[PDB]
Design a protein around this nucleic acid. Structure first.
Ligand SMILES: Nc1nc2c(ncn2[C@@H]2O[C@H](COP(=O)(O)O[C@@H]3[C@H](O)[C@@H](COP(=O)(O)OP(=O)(O)OP(=O)(O)O)O[C@H]3n3cnc4c(=O)[nH]c(N)nc43)[C@@H](O)[C@H]2O)c(=O)[nH]1
Ligand SMILES: Nc1nc2c(ncn2[C@@H]2O[C@H](COP(=O)(O)O[C@@H]3[C@H](O)[C@@H](COP(=O)(O)OP(=O)(O)OP(=O)(O)O)O[C@H]3n3cnc4c(=O)[nH]c(N)nc43)[C@@H](O)[C@H]2O)c(=O)[nH]1
Ligand SMILES: [Mn+2]
Ligand SMILES: [Mn+2]
Ligand SMILES: [Mn+2]
Ligand SMILES: [Mn+2]
Ligand SMILES: [Zn+2]
Ligand SMILES: [Zn+2]
Lengths: 352, 341
DNA sequence: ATCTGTACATGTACAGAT
DNA sequence: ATCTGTACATGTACAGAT
DNA sequence: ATCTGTACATGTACAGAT
DNA sequence: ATCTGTACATGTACAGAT
């Protein structure tokens, strides 16, 4: 039943190679342009992120996420009104994006965007354009057409190599699951800042950046067991990723049908399951034979998050992704009724 | 019982700090002399190895092992008579085939000279034992402390073909750990087999394993469950040391035999729950049983180099092995009287 | 003549295909 | 059960630069 | 290139609780 | 007797500064 759904959701090697070969050409070309004729983004490095590179992309290989990360030493952060996740950056190639020592996200994103657009114009063996800028998005989104519509988000990121900001001190609670050595090593990796980029008429709007832990999330997805052999060729398979896929599909299906659910996103699902993985750390609590129970307990957990208006960021405990300020109580109650319905009627929306 | 023995074997924080502070002074000084003064070993780097740094040193902090590793360009290895572990190898121009003995001699000469210039510590250089890669230092606070300074070539290429089927950790530590470990460099120490032969060393890998030894990532961490893997190693090591001090029939045996055996046992019994502290006795007993089988069948393969049998007739006499078997069997069946000495 | 940033060479895990 | 494409990590060769 | 500062893992020592 | 919490000690990886 749920196994037959996962069969449908499974990507096909044919579609994967056709998608990947075209995506790599465009990314490769954009990346080379960044390290050229004294461009402000010379030295920028590529880091593949998101569902496709975590092997939890469902249905089709039609959306890819790439981080163009730039190392910036000597930066100091100021936390933006105790939000936990938003910061001003302060201190040179990047001199054109400054204003009284404060690095403007929107100025930097604009030039980044301008360059990409120019480079996309010079591609004439692929049908590829740049999507209209959505406010509140750090991404420059490319729309490719070959066998299929394919989205690529190119995400500008500042890379800092110092210790993670204090707001994350109590985050990443993997001690009982992946352990203290994994946590210490992960926290020795750099942290990343992407441009917030909203037009919410607030102070420091265009100079605000948001933390990103996509690199850490990637490691976790691909190293997700308490046993080192979880899902390896001499280990036992778990159903952790399969649950993620199923929850992701439920949300996508609902989202494409109801615009009441615009505020919700797959990152909500990803964050919830990270908490569940912490709560149930044993690989045996994610046995393939117990896919139904496992999926069901995930749904149950997500409903509790919705009811209590509380789903803390996994890395930044005080940043509540389900705050009244972010998502209306009505939106949450709408999604609760929709989830509850599917759960109690055999998930009819899986058959669409 | 066995818990009371481990109490005795436990090092003391006081002795640890007193030993370490003196060892570090001498190593620090020797290391600087290798670079800061223009010698053929400029660029050599320090890597601490062995029981003390694996936290399986027993009784006293009186023996320390340090690798002075030197990165070298693309060398090519020729396997020395299919032994698996020994190879001829191809600034260092003075030691030309790169001669282990010639290189070790200069290394040794330098160290000896530097030790002469130390006048706040009582420290000398032990007489060279042939077939030893080490320059051994003898220190005295009031207490005797040995330090082996081990010259190593560091090579960054793929590990030699003789190791392809070694490190069988797939069902224990897993395929990702194995692949990553095998991406680290490998090392060659001048252990002669003759004077131009080097021996492979995986002390760096053994160190990672000792400190990352569970199937669960949390084994022995503050939010994990403690196992008795290291405690078994300690106990087996003590049994051998105690026997070795009493019988010179056992001169050919060493702690590396014990370490290799337990590596195989850890592979054979990968589950952390098969090494529960509550089952220390069973665990120790099954280790003894395994070691006796190695002795009976004259077979204890190197963990990294499967075809190199450390218990070959060529290395240890059948009589030595039969002697050790009777001695182990006796202790096992009489409540380990030798633990009370 | 030497040095180097870029591209390729080699290996393997994951997961889909047979 | 075996086989195969993609991604990703680490090493090294080399045309263009110094 | 070398050195120091920071953070945290792995030990040990011991008291109060179980 | 064992376990748990705190203190005290050493080791070790890596970033930023010199
Ligand atoms: N791909 C995708 N796009 C979505 C989803 N829901 C909405 N969108 C599109 O995002 C734009 C508006 O931004 P948003 O803040 O509402 O959406 C972001 C982000 O786009 C989304 C997750 O996308 P992703 O990074 O590609 O996800 P992943 O690769 O893990 O899975 P998959 O792509 O298979 O779904 O979540 C939102 N978001 C909020 N906070 C975060 C955060 O910290 N990190 C990330 N990565 N995303 C965050 C509009 O174009 C809208 O259509 C959605 O589910 N998927
Ligand atoms: N410390 C120590 N020394 C020993 C032991 N048995 C003999 N010796 C002394 O070593 C001289 C050389 O003879 P050998 O080649 O038989 O001895 C080596 C090596 O010395 C010994 C293990 O010593 P280690 O490396 O310090 O061990 P670790 O630090 O892990 O444990 P601990 O110090 O707590 O015991 O084993 C022998 N050996 C043989 N092959 C290897 C190998 O591949 N690697 C290593 N590391 N050792 C190997 C003798 O003259 C004698 O004085 C002994 O048990 N311990
Ligand atoms: Mn995505
Ligand atoms: Mn995206
Ligand atoms: Mn030793
Ligand atoms: Mn030694
Ligand atoms: Zn798994
Ligand atoms: Zn353990």
């Amino acid at each position: 039943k749920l196994k037959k759904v996962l069969d449908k959701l499974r990507l096909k090697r044919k579609d994967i190679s056709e998608a990947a070969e075209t995506v790599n050409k465009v990314v490769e070309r954009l990346l080379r342009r960044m390290q050229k004729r004294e461009s402000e983004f010379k030295g920028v490095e590529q880091l593949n992120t998101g569902s496709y590179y975590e092997h939890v992309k469902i249905s089709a290989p039609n959306e890819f996420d790439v981080m163009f990360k730039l190392e910036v030493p000597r930066i100091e952060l100021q936390e933006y009104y105790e939000t936990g996740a938003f910061y001003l950056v302060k201190f040179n190639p990047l001199s054109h994006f400054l204003e009284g020592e404060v690095l403007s996200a929107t100025k930097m994103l604009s030039k980044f965007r301008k360059i990409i657009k120019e480079e996309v114009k010079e591609i004439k063996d692929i049908d590829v354009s740049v999507e209209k800028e959505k406010p509140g998005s750090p991404a420059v989104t490319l729309l490719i057409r070959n066998p299929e519509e394919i989205s690529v988000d190119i995400i500008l990121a500042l890379e800092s190599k110092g210790s993670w900001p204090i707001s994350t001190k109590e985050g990443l609670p993997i001690q009982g699951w992946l352990g203290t050595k994994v946590r210490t090593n992960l926290r020795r990796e750099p942290f990343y800042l992407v441009p917030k980029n909203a037009k919410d008429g607030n102070s420091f709007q265009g100079e605000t950046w948001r933390l990103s832990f996509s690199h850490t999330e990637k490691y976790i997805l691909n190293n997700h067991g308490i046993e080192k052999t979880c899902c390896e060729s001499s280990g036992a398979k778990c159903c952790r990723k399969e649950c993620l896929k199923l929850m992701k599909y439920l949300l996508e299906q609902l989202k494409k049908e109801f615009q009441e659910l615009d505020a919700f996103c797959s990152y909500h699902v990803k964050t919830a399951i990270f908490h569940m993985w912490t709560q149930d750390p044993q690989d045996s609590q994610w046995d393939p034979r117990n896919l139904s129970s496992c999926f069901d307990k995930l749904l149950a957990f997500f409903l509790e998050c919705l009811r209590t208006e509380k789903l803390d960021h996994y890395f930044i405990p005080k940043f509540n992704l389900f705050s009244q300020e972010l998502i209306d109580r009505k939106s949450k109650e709408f999604l609760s009724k929709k989830i509850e319905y599917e759960r109690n009627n055999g998930f009819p929306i899986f058959d669409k």
